[PDB]
Amino acid sequence: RMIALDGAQGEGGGQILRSALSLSMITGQPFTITSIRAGRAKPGLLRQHLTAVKAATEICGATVEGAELGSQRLLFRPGTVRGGDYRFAIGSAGSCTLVLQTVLPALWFADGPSRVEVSGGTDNPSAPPADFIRRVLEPLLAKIGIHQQTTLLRHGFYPAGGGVVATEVSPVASFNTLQLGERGNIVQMRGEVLLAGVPRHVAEREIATLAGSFSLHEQNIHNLPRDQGPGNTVSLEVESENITERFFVVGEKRVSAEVVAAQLVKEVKRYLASTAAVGEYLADQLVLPMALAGAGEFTVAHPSSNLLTNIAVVERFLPVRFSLIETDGVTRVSIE
Numbered sequence: 001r002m003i004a005l006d007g008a009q010g011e012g013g014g015q016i017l018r019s020a021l022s023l024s025m026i027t028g029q030p031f032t033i034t035s036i037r038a039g040r041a042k043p044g045l046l047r048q049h050l051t052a053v054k055a056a057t058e059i060c061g062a063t064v065e066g067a068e069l070g071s072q073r074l075l076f077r078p079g080t081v082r083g084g085d086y087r088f089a090i091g092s093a094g095s096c097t098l099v100l101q102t103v104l105p106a107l108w109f110a111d112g113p114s115r116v117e118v119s120g121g122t123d124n125p126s127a128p129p130a131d132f133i134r135r136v137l138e139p140l141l142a143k144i145g146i147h148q149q150t151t152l153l154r155h156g157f158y159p160a161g162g163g164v165v166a167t168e169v170s171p172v173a174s175f176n177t178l179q180l181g182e183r184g185n186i187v188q189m190r191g192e193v194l195l196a197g198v199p200r201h202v203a204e205r206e207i208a209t210l211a212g213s214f215s216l217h218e219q220n221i222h223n224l225p226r227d228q229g230p231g232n233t234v235s236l237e238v239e240s241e242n243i244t245e246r247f248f249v250v251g252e253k254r255v256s257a258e259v260v261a262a263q264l265v266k267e268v269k270r271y272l273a274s275t276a277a278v279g280e281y282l283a284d285q286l287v288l289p290m291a292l293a294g295a296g297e298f299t300v301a302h303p304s305s306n307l308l309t310n311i312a313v314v315e316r317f318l319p320v321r322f323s324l325i326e327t328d329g330v331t332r333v334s335i336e
C-alpha cells in the first residue's frame with residue numbers, strides 16, 4: 001500500500017529513515033516520511049542520510065521523490081534488491097557505518113554475497129564505530145544466522161572525513177534464536193586509545209584513569225598518521241560471560257584527557273550497575289535483526305527512543321510483535 005511515517009517520532013532523528021529504508025527494501029513495501037529531522041540544527045537530509053537514500057535506491061532500483069540535501073520529505077518505492085559490489089561516498093565526515101546500517105539488511109536476502117564500501121566519517125561520537133560493529137554487533141548477528149564482516153580501511157575524523165569502511169555480507173541460509181538474559185560475570189575488560197595528530201601523553205593519561213577504576217586485561221594505544229586526524233577516541237570493551245559490549249568517547253579540543261576518560265568510566269559503570277545484557281545502543285541495533293529472524297530477546301536497562309522507534313517501524317512493516325516487560329529496573333525486549 002503506502003506506509004506514512006512521521007519523522008518527528010521518538011527523538012526525531014535519522015534512525016526512523018534508515019530503518020524504514022531497510023525494511024522497505026526487504027519487504028517491497030513503499031513508504032512516505034515527512035518532517036525528516038525537522039527539529040534539528042541542520043534539518044532534513046544531511047550527506048549521511050542522502051547517501052543512505054542513494055545507496056538504497058541504487059541497490060533496489062527504487063522510485064524516489066525528494067532525495068536531496070536538506071529535504072524533509074521522502075517517498076520511496078523499492079524495486080528488486082540486487083547483490084553486488086557497491087561503493088558510496090558521503091563527501092563529509094558523516095557516518096560511514098550508518099550508511100552501511102541502512103543497506104546491509106537488504107543484502108542478507110540477495111541471491112549471492114555482496115560487498116559495500118562507504119567513504120566518510122569513522123569516529124563520529126553519535127554513531128556505531130566500525131570496531132563496535134565488528135566486535136559487538138556482528139558476533140551477535142552470527143548467532144542469529146546473519147553473516148557479515150565489517151572492516152575499517154582508513155580513519156576519517158571530523159570535519160575532514162576521508163575514512164573508509166567496508167562490509168562483506170553473505171545471504172542468510174537459516175535463522176537461529178538468540179536469547180540474552182543477564183550480563184553474567186566479567187571475564188575481561190580492555191581499554192583502548194586512538195590517536196591522530198594528538199600528543200602521545202594524552203593516551204597515557206586516558207588509560208591511567210581507566211586502570212585506576214578497572215582491572216584491565218589489555219591496555220592498547222593506537223597511533224595513526226596526522227592526516228587521518230586530528231582525532232582522539234577512548235574505548236572500553238567489557239567482556240562478560242554471556243556477552244561482550246563496548247563503549248567509547250571522542251575527545252574534543254577544549255575538553256581535557258583525564259575527564260574524557262572520566263565520562264567513559266561513568267557510562268561504563270552505568271552499564272555495570274544493571275544486570276542488563278545489552279547496552280543502550282546495541283539494544284536498538286538488535287531490533288531489526290531479531291525481527292527478521294522471527295524470534296529472539298534481550299534485556300536492556302533503559303529502553304531508548306531509538307529502540308522504541310525501531311520497534312514501531314518494524315511493526316508497521318512486518319507481522320512480528322514485540323513485548324516489553326520490566327523486572328526490577330531491567331526491561332526484557334522479546335518477540336512474541
Ligand SMILES: Nc1ncnc2c1ncn2[C@@H]1O[C@H](COP(=O)(O)OP(=O)(O)OP(=O)(O)O)[C@@H](O)[C@H]1O
Pocket residue numbers: 011012013014015016037040125126127128129132247248280281282284285306
Ligand atoms: N556510542 C555508541 N555506540 C554504538 N552505537 C551508537 C553509539 N551512539 C549511537 N549509536 C547508534 O547510532 C544510531 C544513532 O542514530 P540517531 O538518529 O541517534 O543519529 P544521530 O547521530 O544522533 O543524529 P540525528 O539524531 O540528528 O540524526 C543508533 O543506532 C545508535 O544506537
Ligand SMILES: [Mn+2]
Pocket residue numbers: 011013014126
Ligand atoms: Mn540522535
